[PDB]
Amino acid sequence: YTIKVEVPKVATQTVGGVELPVAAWRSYLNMELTIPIFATNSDCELIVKAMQGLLKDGNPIPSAIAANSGIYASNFTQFVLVDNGGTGDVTVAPSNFANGVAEWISSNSRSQAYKVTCSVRQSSAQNRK
Amino acid sequence: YTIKVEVPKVATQTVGGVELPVAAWRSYLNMELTIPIFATNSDCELIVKAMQGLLKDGNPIPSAIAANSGIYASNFTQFVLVDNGGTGDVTVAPSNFANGVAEWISSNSRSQAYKVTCSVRQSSAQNRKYTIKVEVPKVATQTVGGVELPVAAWRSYLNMELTIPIFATNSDCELIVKAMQGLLKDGNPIPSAIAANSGIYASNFTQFVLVDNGGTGDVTVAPSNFANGVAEWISSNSRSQAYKVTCSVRQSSAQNRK
Amino acid sequence: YTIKVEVPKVATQTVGGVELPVAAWRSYLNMELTIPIFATNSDCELIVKAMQGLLKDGNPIPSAIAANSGIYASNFTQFVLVDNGGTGDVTVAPSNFANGVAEWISSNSRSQAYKVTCSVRQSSAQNRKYTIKVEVPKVATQTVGGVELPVAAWRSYLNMELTIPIFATNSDCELIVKAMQGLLKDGNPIPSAIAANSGIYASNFTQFVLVDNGGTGDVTVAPSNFANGVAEWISSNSRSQAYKVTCSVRQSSAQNRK
Amino acid sequence: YTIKVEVPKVATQTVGGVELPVAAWRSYLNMELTIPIFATNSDCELIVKAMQGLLKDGNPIPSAIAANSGIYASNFTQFVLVDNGGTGDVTVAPSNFANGVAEWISSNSRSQAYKVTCSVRQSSAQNRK
Amino acid sequence: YTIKVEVPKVATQTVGGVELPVAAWRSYLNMELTIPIFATNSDCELIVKAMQGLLKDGNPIPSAIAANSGIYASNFTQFVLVDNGGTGDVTVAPSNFANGVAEWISSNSRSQAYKVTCSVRQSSAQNRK
């Protein structure tokens, strides 16, 4: 799997006196996951559980990021990307499935929107990337 | 957005038979829409409203298409391009007929005006082709050399090509116009997807009425394919005698979405 | 003036169907008119009257066309080319049949005579072609070497090509003749524009009866296109089975208008 | 805009004893108008008003010309070019719209007729000529 | 005759924080008129009448311009160039007669003013341009 996420910072920009909604900067997340062909569905569930537990609230890895510090069909559906207790949530919706790459986009201007992509590819004879 | 429509010829047609050549029995519609990335949802709703007002009954373009005619000195009239409930309406007026291209612009400066152009041509021996273009601006004031000028921050572009065989009866052209009107009706999948900056994936991919004939004789299209992300609707007919609708969306360039 | 007419074949025709090949179902008429810049309105009315008298019922050319025939020794007769209410009428008489071209001239000198020529030919495997030419003079006296001679100051030229498929019935040829007669009837847009040295723009661009069948079964043509200045009329049919009329006017050279 | 007007002087000419109606001479008027794309309809109305006021009766420019002295669809319609109080008026009628150039011609012989042409063209990126 | 007219668009411009009255853009009108030496004063009056009728309100040529659309001594005196019903009129006044070219200028700043010029010259042996 190759999964990419983009988080923007929404703002207004003045191009010669003209106001346009843009993103001041964007943060990128890239992740690659390799699974051997011998893996049973239970092994895949264990991998998913490990990934979920890596970023649970209160653990060192998410706590470092949260303060900018260090160490001291039927599947192409809209889902909630950012949950803020029911108010201020960010929802992405499917947009494109060209070249075997699925895409999601939040309901906003394209310049101020969240972007999520996911794709699978048989990289090796015994590994699926 | 890329949209394609295929309409069958009904006059003197035998149901379930073989009718050749293919080009003598089918009408083709191809629509391309370019929207800049700076447009919000409210801009998309305005673009959808402009499209709904372009093909409304009684206006020059549907009247010309429904009667196999071109643009002449009796249907060249001003019409409401964008309807906003009687307040803030955007209307266009005849402004040019040079080189065989009919043009309408709104009562604004040349840098802040809605633009409509229409042309017809005998493209082949047995085919006639309509070319239609619409330009929708985003008005702004921009300061050059310390002086303010009216400009457009960006423009949204719509182009349409319509190919009709010479054997089509006036009723066939009326069917084409009705299908065009029913494609963009409010509440249908494509305008809803356009107004929300999204695509057609699983919950808006539903069957809908393409041709409305007062309850009796209506034409309904149902989903039939989703390969490569392109959504496809067909009617209850053979693939050679059915209404076909295909829709897809991609990112053409870094500044626009098609 | 450049004028084009398209006539459909009606015998054994199915309404709204597909009929192939195209060349087996349609008749074509192409007319070119060259008028010198020195002609006034009264000269144009005389030219229009000559055209009206050329295609009047009972005359050699319409009789030959309506019966698929050529020119032979029973319809080769003299006829009134220009009618001026019994006084000042211009008549032509048979004068030549060499090389397969039938010729008529008026009772005047060879330099001051109205000229009419007609020929037929099997131009293609399934098409027959009529070529018709008319020459209208402007008589004058000109002094060369101190001696007066009769000459023509200028000549107005009319040429017509008519293509008919071999499958056409006598009734189809009668329909063609009636359409030809109704095109140039007094009060219709084209003769009115020709008589006034003008074109078809907005007020003479009106619908008119092309084929007159005694009130019942009449054919009416209505405006449908005005691109590039060319005026176009069609009947209430598909573009493959309708009567089509196109008219345009330009300046061919510094001395003539076409 | 590029607007041209031709005014003839009607006469009869003897070509070897043959009388022909011709124009002894013709007067030509050529005018070019440039309008920026930023112009509002009110600006265009102001320009039209200035053009009309440049040639109003009693002003220096028309008075110099009148004595040969100096300084001391729905639009292709017939209109009156010369107004002479309802008697002796000159009316032009549309004739041709080839190559994007509209033409008008008075109801006379072509050799003794008034000629009016008008055409528009995008000469520059910000100017319409 | 060679007649030129300039119509400005008045505005204020900020040069490094300094306000100056300027014209954002200018529209130019150029016209050339040729009259043969055989023309009688009546012919010149007819030419002036044709020029006036070319731009009368309601005719195709001024109506196209008004909406930016197409086709579908004793003479050097001040005169009204733009008439707005007695309120908001634009008046030009004589300024210069150098090199045989007469000039008019509206009573404003030179950067925001209307400019009218007129000059006559014998271009050919039988034509006056």
Residue type, C22: V
Residue B94: list chain E partners with CB under 8 A.
69, 72
Residue A14: list chain B partners with CB under 8 A.
none
Output the six-digit token pair for C56: 């009047």
- Cα–Cα distance for residue pair D4/D33, rounded to 1 Å: 12
B173's enclosing H/E stretch is: helix B170-183
- Residue in B with minimal Cα distance to A104: B198
Output the six-digit token pair for B17: 């038979």
In sequence order, the β-bridge partners of residue D20 are D13
Output the six-digit token pair for B182: 């029913």
Subunit contact B73:C227, Cβ cutoff 8 A: no
- Point out residues after which chain A has a gap (C–N over 2.5 Å): 72
Subunit contact C238:B100, Cβ cutoff 8 A: no
- Cα–Cα distance for residue pair B231/B248, rounded to 1 Å: 7
Beta strand C208-211 pairing with D79-82: unpaired
First-residue to last-residue Cα distance in chain D: 5
Identify the residue whose tokens are 């042409």: D117
Q: Which of B93, B94, B147 sits opposite E24 (nearest CB)?
A: B147
For the purposes of burial, counting CB atoms within 10 Å of the CB of E27, is it exposed (0-12), middle (13-18) or buried (19 or more)?
A: buried
Residue B68, chain C, CB below 8 Å: the answer is: yes
- Give the Cβ contact number of residue D107 at 10 Å: 15
Q: Which of B12, B71, B170 sits opposite C236 (nearest CB)?
A: B170
Radius of gyration in angstroms for the set of CA atoms belonging to chain B, rounded to a whole number: 19
- Residue in C with minimal Cα distance to B127: C239
Residue spans of beta strands (DSSP E) within chain C: 2-8, 26-36, 79-82, 90-96, 102-106, 115-121, 127-144, 147-165, 208-211, 219-225, 231-234, 244-248, 256-257
Interface test with D, best of C111, C197, C205, C257 (most D CBs within 10 A): C197
Determine if residue D74 is left, alpha or beta; phi over 0 gives left, psi from -120 to 50 gives alpha, anything else beta: left
Identify the residue whose tokens are 């107005």: C156
For the purposes of burial, counting CB atoms within 10 Å of the CB of D12, is it exposed (0-12), middle (13-18) or buried (19 or more)?
A: exposed
Interior angle at CA A49, CA A44 and CA A53, nearest 5:
150
Min Cα distance C235 → chain B (Å) is 10
In sequence order, the β-bridge partners of residue B5 are B29, B245
Per the CB < 8 A criterion, the answer to whether A76 and B201 are in contact is yes
Subunit contact C203:D78, Cβ cutoff 8 A: yes
Supply the DSSP string of D47-107, one letter for each residue: HHHHHHHHT-TTSHHHHHHHTT------SS--EEEE-STTSS-EEEEEEE-GGG-EEEEES
- Residue in B with minimal Cα distance to D98: B99
Residue ranges of the alpha helices (H) in E15-59?
41-54
- Residue in D with minimal Cα distance to C140: D18
Output the six-digit token pair for B136: 């929708």
Residue A115: list chain B partners with CB under 8 A.
none
Residue D127: list chain B partners with CB under 8 A.
none
Output the six-digit token pair for E25: 């853009």
What's phi and psi for D90, nearest 5 deg? Answer: -115, 120
What's phi and psi for D61, nearest 5 deg? Answer: -65, -50
Output the six-digit token pair for A30: 């890239």
What's phi and psi for D43, nearest 5 deg? Answer: -65, -40
- Cα–Cα distance for residue pair D114/D121, rounded to 1 Å: 24
Which of the 8 DSSP states describes residue B7?
E
Residue C144, chain D, CB below 8 Å: the answer is: yes
Per-residue CA distances from D49 to B18, E55, E62 (Å): 67, 10, 9
Q: Among B186, B209, B197, B194, which residue's Cα sits nearest to residue B247?
A: B194
Residue type, D70: G
Q: Which of residues 171-200 of B touch C (CB under 8 A)?
A: 172
Per the CB < 8 A criterion, the answer to whether B151 and D38 are in contact is yes
Subunit contact C238:B19, Cβ cutoff 8 A: no
Per-residue CA distances from D118 to D42, D75, D110 (Å): 22, 12, 19
Residue D71, chain C, CB below 8 Å: the answer is: no
Residue C226: list chain D partners with CB under 8 A.
73
Radius of gyration in angstroms for the set of CA atoms belonging to chain D, rounded to a whole number: 18
Q: Among D107, D115, D116, D95, which residue's Cα sits nearest to residue C195?
A: D107
Touch D-A: 3+ C-beta pairs under 8 A? no
Subunit contact E71:B98, Cβ cutoff 8 A: yes
Supply the DSSP string of C101-121, one letter for each residue: -EEEEESS-TTS--EEEEEEE
Residue B201, chain A, CB below 8 Å: the answer is: yes
Subunit contact D60:E52, Cβ cutoff 8 A: no
- Cα–Cα distance for residue pair A98/D20, rounded to 1 Å: 76
In sequence order, the β-bridge partners of residue D127 are D36
Output the six-digit token pair for C107: 């009772």
Residue B145, chain E, CB below 8 Å: the answer is: yes
Return all residues near A39 (Cβ < 8 A) that are at least 6 apart: A47
Supply the DSSP string of C113-164, one letter for each residue: --EEEEEEE--SSSEEEEEEEEEEEEEEEEEETTEEEEEEEEEEEEEEEEEE
Q: Which of residues 13-32 of E touch D (CB under 8 A)?
A: 24-25, 27-32
What's phi and psi for D30, nearest 5 deg? Answer: -125, 130
- Cα–Cα distance for residue pair E113/E93, rounded to 1 Å: 11
Output the six-digit token pair for C72: 């032979």
Per the CB < 8 A criterion, the answer to whether A16 and B142 are in contact is yes
Return all residues near C44 (Cβ < 8 A) that are at least 6 apart: C35, C194, C195, C196, C197
- Give the Cβ contact number of residue B247 at 10 Å: 23
- Cα–Cα distance for residue pair E88/E107, rounded to 1 Å: 13
Interior angle at CA B222, CA B218 and CA B227, nearest 5:
150
Which of the 8 DSSP states describes residue A108?
S
In sequence order, the β-bridge partners of residue C148 are C143
Subunit contact E82:D54, Cβ cutoff 8 A: no
Which of the 8 DSSP states describes residue C228?
G
Subunit contact B170:C15, Cβ cutoff 8 A: no
Touch B-E: 3+ C-beta pairs under 8 A? yes
Q: Which of D16, D74, D76 sits opposite C143 (nearest CB)?
A: D16
Output the six-digit token pair for B251: 């990112």
- Residue in D with minimal Cα distance to C197: D107
Q: How many residues belong to chain A?
A: 129
Residue type, B133: K
Identify the residue whose tokens are 């709104």: B106
Interface test with B, best of A6, A13, A18, A22 (most B CBs within 10 A): A18
- Cα–Cα distance for residue pair D116/D124, rounded to 1 Å: 25
Interface test with B, best of C18, C20, C221, C232 (most B CBs within 10 A): C18
Size of interface B-C (CB pairs under 8 A): 80
